[PDB]
């Protein structure tokens, strides 16, 4: 079927029930988004609002970017984690320590290029890391 391009520069990880920020059946350990800058990919705008504001309460500076959103994400305040869907349109991304994604759009499993395009975020200068909720389909 579709063959996504490889990319060993990024380490792949499997989200698990470990952390304080509850996610799609997984618990994101702040160690993946706290301690620096991270980009979280979400499939729902309502969650981007709580997920980002919630991080501010956890101790992380988080922002949500989606259709109809205001420029708020700022990579110049210590440690900021950007949680957005396909609205950031990269441009200045790439410099992230890791990318936490749900690997499923609209509740359905993403498509081959989705991770190909989404994975391209961590690994600009060093080995990026990618943590996803679901591994794939079967």
UniProtKB/Swiss-Prot annotation:
What is its membrane topology? Peripheral membrane protein
Q: Which branch of life, at top level?
A: Viruses
Per the entry, the cofactor note is: Binds 1 zinc ion, which has a structural role. The magnesium ion is essential for the helicase activity.
Cofactor dependence:
Zn(2+); Mg(2+)
**Where is the protein localized?**
Host endoplasmic reticulum membrane
Q: Where is this region: RNA-binding?
A: 117-128
Could you tell me what reaction this enzyme catalyses?
Answer: Hydrolysis of four peptide bonds in the viral precursor polyprotein, commonly with Asp or Glu in the P6 position, Cys or Thr in P1 and Ser or Ala in P1'; a ribonucleoside 5'-triphosphate + H2O = a ribonucleoside 5'-diphosphate + phosphate + H(+); ATP + H2O = ADP + phosphate + H(+)
Subunit field text: Interacts with protease NS2. Interacts with non-structural protein 4A; this interaction stabilizes the folding of NS3 serine protease. NS3-NS4A interaction is essential for NS3 activation and allows membrane anchorage of the latter. NS3/NS4A complex also prevents phosphorylation of host IRF3, thus preventing the establishment of dsRNA induced antiviral state. Interacts with host MAVS; this interaction leads to the cleavage and inhibition of host MAVS. Interacts with host TICAM1; this interaction leads to the cleavage and inhibition of host TICAM1.
- What is the protein's known function? Displays three enzymatic activities: serine protease with a chymotrypsin-like fold, NTPase and RNA helicase. NS3 serine protease, in association with NS4A, is responsible for the cleavages of NS3-NS4A, NS4A-NS4B, NS4B-NS5A and NS5A-NS5B. The NS3/NS4A complex prevents phosphorylation of host IRF3, thus preventing the establishment of dsRNA induced antiviral state. The NS3/NS4A complex induces host amino acid transporter component SLC3A2, thus contributing to HCV propagation.
Domain note for this entry? The N-terminal one-third contains the protease activity. This region contains a zinc atom that does not belong to the active site, but may play a structural rather than a catalytic role. This region is essential for the activity of protease NS2, maybe by contributing to the folding of the latter. The NTPase/helicase activity is located in the twothirds C-terminus of NS3, this domain contains the NTPase and RNA-binding regions.
| Stated name of the protein | Serine protease/helicase NS3
């Amino acid at each position: 079927g579709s063959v996504t391009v490889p990319h060993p520069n990024i380490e792949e990880v499997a989200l698990s029930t470990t952390g304080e920020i509850p996610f799609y059946g997984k618990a994101i350990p702040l160690e993946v988004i706290k301690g620096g800058r991270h980009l979280i990919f979400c499939h729902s705008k309502k969650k981007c609002d709580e997920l980002a504001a919630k991080l501010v309460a956890l101790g992380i500076n988080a922002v949500a970017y989606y259709r109809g959103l205001d420029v708020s994400v700022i990579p110049t305040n210590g440690d900021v984690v950007v949680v957005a869907t396909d609205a950031l349109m990269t441009g200045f991304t790439g410099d992230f320590d890791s990318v936490i994604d749900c690997n499923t759009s609209d509740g359905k499993p993403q498509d081959a290029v989705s991770r190909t395009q989404r994975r391209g975020r961590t690994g600009r200068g060093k080995p990026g890391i990618y943590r996803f909720v679901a591994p794939g389909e079967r």
